[PDB]
Amino acid sequence: DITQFSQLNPPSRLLMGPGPINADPRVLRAMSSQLIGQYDPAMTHYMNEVMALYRGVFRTENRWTMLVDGTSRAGIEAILVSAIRPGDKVLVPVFGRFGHLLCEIARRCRAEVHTIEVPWGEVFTPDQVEDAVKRIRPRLLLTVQGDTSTTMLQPLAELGEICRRYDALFYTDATASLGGNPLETDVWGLDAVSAGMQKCLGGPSGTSPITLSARMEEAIRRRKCVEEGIRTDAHRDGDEEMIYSNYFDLGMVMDYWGPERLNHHTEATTALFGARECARLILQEGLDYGIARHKLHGDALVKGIQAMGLETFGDLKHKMNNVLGVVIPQGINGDQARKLMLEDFGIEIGTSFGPLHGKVWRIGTMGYNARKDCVMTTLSALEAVLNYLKFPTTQGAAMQAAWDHYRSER
Template sequence: MQPLSLPPRLLMGPGPINCYPRVLSAMSTQLVGQYDPTMTSYMNEVMALYRRVFNTQNQQTFLIDGTSRAGIEAALVSCLEPGDKVLIPIFGRFGHLLAEIAERADAEVHTIEVPWGEVFDPQQIEDAIKKVQPKLLAIVQGDTSTTMFQPLEELGDICRAHDVLFYTDATASIGGNPLEVDAWKIDAVSVGLQKCLGGPSGSAPITLNDRFVSCVRKRAHVEAGIRDAHHHGSSGMRIRSNYFDLPMIMDYWGDERLNHHTEAATMLFGSRECAIQLLNEGQDAVLKRHQLAGNAMLQGVLAMGLMPFGNLKHKMNNVVGVHIPVNVDGEKIRHDLLAIFNIEIGTSFGPLKGKVWRIGTMGYNARQDAVLHTLQSLETVLRRAGFGLPAGAAVDAAMAVYSGEV
């Protein structure tokens, strides 16, 4: 029963990452009651802050209490009725997650796939929409399993042309890559804090436009009618989750403050600070910082003679996949990095299990010293394991990026 004592890890994997110090400080703040005017004013402020983070005017912008998966589930379970068609383009592990959640909502799930390491051309998605005629298009923007970044700019117009709702999970990409919710006509977006936003897992910011709100509100009206009729049988229209019932959560965050749950105040304080950190630095500045750190890491990896994974044209700024060299024990390298240098990098799963490392540069860790320390340590561990590479080349290559020589 000793106090918490964690090793000083530098988290350079695909997430979670080390938090901004101000976020940790905010989360140590004492609580007030959930309907205290101070608390509700901070809830309102968080809504306003995340409208700016999402680049949206959506009134319905708030937090789902839970990890980023909670935001995904709230969006899909509240929108999809049994039998509804949903189209899910899959280019990595988290597309499969969207499909599983939609299946559990008893939706009629249609998927299209590209090889891991690639992304979809908008025409592929439009062709599938024409064929399936879904109620909803659900797609991941950035999938850390493959490090790929799916372009979304054209999909909103495609969905509007075919009267399809458009949802994306942008957990892995927001903050370090462009996301323009209103300009791209995205109807619903959910994210998490534990990547480029520089916070802990445990809160899922979400934004819903009027089209999406209208869809889920219709289901709330049906449910109210069922209750009024004292009908307790099953209904295909009812939102099956109480916790993830978006209309109820909107009423909790709205002016009526109808009780639904007790807001996770500590996570709200942390979420607020994540948004302030981003907005104070400036979205463009944060984006450029992630581009710089990601490129420095990539050039360092290349200088070591390692091969990046996937189509680099569509790589996220904040994570790079690296093929594990032949005759190198990938898990032994990860173990030694962690045990000797206190640095964590990621492995992968699915078809990439044991074949790829994933190295992140995001949030608080998208900075020069973290990049250089990781590259120097990885080089050292690889050389000691017998992998021949030019000493110092990785750090030199990364420093050339930071000095503007590349």
Template sequence: MGPGPINADPRVLRAMSAPLLGQYDPAMTAYMTETQELYRQVFRTANDATLLVDGTSRSGIEAVLVSLLEPGDRVLVPVFGRFGHLLKEIAERCLAEVHVIEAEWGTVFEPEQLEAAIVEVRPKVLALVQGDTSTTMCQPLADVGEICRRHGVLFYSDVTASLGGNAFEMDGWGLDAATAGLQKCLAGPSGSAPTSLSDAAVEVIRSRKHVEAGIRESSDDLDEEATIRPRIRSNYFDLGMILDYWGPRRLNHHTEASSMLYGARECARLLVNEGMGTAIERHRLHGAAILAGVQGLGLEVFGDVAHKMNNVVAVEIPAGLDGDGARSAMLHDFGIEIGTSFGPLHGRVWRIGTMGYNARHDAVLGTLAALEQVLRGGGLSPVPGGGVAAAKEVYAG
């Protein structure tokens, strides 16, 4: 019950146990096509370039940034938690000119702040996390795409922690690139990075030289502009080549991680069958229940609750209580894992997740009951049954 990874849905694990197929078996390529269509519905997009990058969620982030950014390109990274710093680091490794604006942890950016920074920096790409689990904040994105369009900026968001449990409209909000992972609201294991790219992003990627030297027969195989543009600096994360692999030509790039594809396909299938709106409401309901529950135990919540993600809450560790000892007791006495956080919040808060397969009544109520006993064992005096009672009030409507 931490901020992720979470328990995978048993149906996802069962799908991953299916026999392996060759990557050009007609059944396998059909699964790839089905997976692309399912993730178009998850991302809420019509983008043809919707696919999986084989690797953890960070692989999708790196693939997008290394494929969009050339050395010297300006990128603006608004940072309001740990994972904005990650986008900054990866962009720096792409040799981009990285500009950062920061918001206090526990808050988010207003559209006016983002537009002012865009006007000042004039970046090629805005790279912005939607949900940052380090602070539990969910950055509003609905107005950002239109701002980026007005100023000719490509808009990328890392939605690893938020997709499937919080509203996200790729096309409706004007995003050019988005990447995710399975291990949060998508109810799967880490190891696959669903990714979607707009036509504008694909055009930028296609303009980069990604044909390997020695494979083309002559320089005529690349147009004049491509020959003078820097090649994408990674082979594995070259989205131009990965697009060819997932596209109708099925050009070989790497051996597909078949079991992960089965799992990613099942994650999306379950969400689509549930209905994206229904899944988001499920996460909102259980997130509201755990929030009310920890408050019912007398605990303080970190950050601006109005901008909290549906699927994780940060709880201030009470003064005088051994936070790590309490987490250890939760794990060893009750078999429930909760997390701490990073940087300035390490040892200051617990993070409790209600996401994916764990966005359930029994998981929420069991966690609150266990936490009450751990608090009492640590010398505190929470209201008997206060957490469970508060959560049940939420469920009762």
């Protein structure tokens, strides 16, 4: 019966996993706003505002800063499909799960995929990526900045200089790290950045902010091929082969956001309203302050976890501010502590996949949930569940260290 389909009623949740995390209530309210037509002066104005705001968030002057209407990895694929002609040599430094995602996307683009690897969860040295760039001579360097599966944050500062010397295009996947970690697009010589909403932005998934450098926009303009239905007598192709997607042809997407207002697709009015608010909030607070906030609560969680008598995963010198790997004590079922946290406390913490499944928990402190009270509620909840499942902890230690960190820093 159609009668037993009632109104939307999701249960209340504190999402402290690797994502998606709770949306900021201002972003949610802005999505309920009524729509206007595709080319209404207000809609074109709001599109132009989104560009200016995300230029601030990405820390770039790039003319082409916009949205791909799809989840984070649609942005990735849009950038790769637009920058990779079949046969092109691509270099992917793999330090986790999302390095393999780049490999697959690149392979679906028919690229020549060359990889370098370090174990989970470690990071790459600038020398390591320089030796690889000298060996294979790639068109693109395809990096993930923050990889949620390993909690590791790849240093990106010294890599852009390396890419300019050997004429490589420098792309990063910043969906996990943007807003909660430093990302200087221009200062670090980045050519393409793709992000997401559901990490530190806040932020339901469905949009991918991207930015393309002047060098990157030239490579795509050589690929120019306008869709037949909106092709005029004054449109002409570029010197190189077309992009093998109509939806992900970023040249046409650029022409939609540009003065031409080329009718590539109907922009996601609501998701645009959402995206505008995220960047607006991030810049009202300030990027530096926003990043400083993620560091404060990330560290407080670490110090809480360490005092609970728990090992942590990875090289902490390079840990993301917003993700923590927590080793499962042993004699303790991980799926059971996850089930108890959720059903009895309303707190979701992440499981790890593959070579870590049943070994490591992933606790995020991102965007809206990067607060003291989210950290405090999670630590007290985790400890309570562990004691109930017979894991001894020093009474008050985990909580004391959390307070000690919050007291000392302010």
